[PDB]
Ligand binder design. Sequence first.
Ligand code: A1CLX
Length: 164
Amino acid sequence: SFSGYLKLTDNVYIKNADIVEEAKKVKPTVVVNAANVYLKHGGGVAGALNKATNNAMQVESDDYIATNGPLKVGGSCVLSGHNLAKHCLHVVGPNVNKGEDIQLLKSAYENFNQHEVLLAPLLSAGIFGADPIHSLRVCVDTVRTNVYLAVFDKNLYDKLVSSF
Ligand SMILES: O=C(O)C1=C(c2ccc3ncsc3c2)CCC1
């Protein structure tokens, strides 16, 4: 069902695309959200995915936090994918702009290995403040399952491919 991707490795693929539009087209089994520990989906990929669900992702996430408390940096939880996917895997990469340890990025990507195939964004990139080239390197070196990476920014996509 995924089309137009560049193969980087045996199991990692990449495309210049909006992950929201990709999820609406493919209806993947799992879409990854670039979450924070409170599951407050205000901006970046999380704000865009939540708006595409008409805020249903945020209402579900608030009930999850009321029952379970916050996630760990490097951790994840599986919730509904609403109108975008069967499931959403909310994964917390470290936010460098909040002073979090970049070494937790490998632990964040290890959550992907629990799912045979995923549609995902680059973790800890964008407003999370990490170097996207480093994030793609950790993804390739950690994830063993089939990951389809959707990169929204065209200039970033071109830089990630040409420096890989
Ligand atoms: O350019 C990108 O691929 C990146 C992100 C992003 C942010 C917001 C957004 N809204 C719709 S698709 C999307 C992707 C976060 C990390 C890198």
